[PDB]
Design a protein around this ligand. Structure first.
Ligand SMILES: [Zn+2]
Ligand SMILES: [Zn+2]
Lengths: 74, 49, 147
């Protein structure tokens, strides 16, 4: 399953994922693709910040859903 | 041409309304609005002026 | 009706999602959404995610959605409670307007406040009389509440 992660830049990075993937995993895929440390990734989808523990499916992320990546700069 | 109120297309064979300002809507769509307001949903020009 | 229109909007958000904001159903009830607004740039909110509740009334789009911040924010037009004094959400509502346009105009509000019609007088005086105090406090609030 392919999803889109939109950054503030506007750049849309694409990810191969499975609904069962943790947000943890997705952040790890984002790190793998674009080099960002997962601790400085906030993922948003449909007004919700995505919690690490939880999964793509139980945020209802589907094929071609677009997440938003904002960075925390901690 | 898309009705800005219902976001469905303005098809041939539908009851449509062009306001004096030249903006098109489904009649049934805009009539609900013109009930509560005499202003064009798109440009806000008053339909009586 | 409302539901069709809400679904169309949502379908359009998926097809072509805005950067700078995100929105959708809190659960399966389509009439209650959440949205995020990224603090507009060239503005003291930059870097903050601001969470909003959107409640669509039963006769949307003919009545505006109730839109509130849940992130606390320093702004002349948002109080604590996160009520928003923005024209299009009251007198200048139009059924031509979408939630994304609402969201834009709230971002627009964040960029350019209306201190002359302020929901929070305190903050309006400061916005005008001392801008850099206003920015400083807004930036501080951002970092405390939106980051
Ligand atoms: Zn219509
Ligand atoms: Zn018009």
């Amino acid at each position: 399953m392919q999803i889109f992660v939109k950054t503030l830049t506007g750049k849309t990075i694409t990810l191969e994922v499975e609904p069962s993937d943790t947000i943890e995993n997705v952040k790890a895929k984002i790190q793998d693709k674009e080099g960002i440390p997962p601790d400085q990734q906030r993922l948003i989808f449909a007004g919700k910040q995505l919690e690490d523990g939880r999964t793509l499916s139980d945020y209802n992320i589907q094929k071609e859903s677009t997440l938003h990546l904002v960075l925390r700069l901690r | 041409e898309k009705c800005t109120i219902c976001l469905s297309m303005l098809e041939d064979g539908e009851d449509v309304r062009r306001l004096p300002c030249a903006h098109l809507f489904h009649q049934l769509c805009v009539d609900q609005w013109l009930a509560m307001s005499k202003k064009c949903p798109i440009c806000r020009v008053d339909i009586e002026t | 009706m409302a539901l069709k229109r809400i679904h169309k909007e949502l379908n359009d958000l998926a097809r072509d999602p805005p950067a700078q904001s995100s929105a959708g159903p809190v659960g399966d009830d389509m009439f209650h959404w959440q949205a995020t607004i990224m603090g507009p740039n060239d503005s003291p909110y930059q870097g903050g995610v601001f969470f909003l509740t959107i409640h669509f009334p039963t006769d949307y789009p003919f009545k505006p959605p109730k839109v509130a911040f849940t992130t606390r924010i320093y702004h002349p037009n948002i109080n604590s409670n996160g009520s928003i004094k923005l024209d299009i959400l009251r007198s200048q509502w139009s059924p031509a307007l979408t939630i994304s346009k609402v969201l834009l105009s709230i971002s627009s509000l964040l960029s350019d406040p209306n201190p002359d019609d302020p929901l929070v007088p305190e903050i309006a005086r400061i916005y005008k009389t001392d801008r850099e105090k206003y920015n400083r406090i807004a930036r501080e609030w951002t970092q405390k509440y939106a980051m």
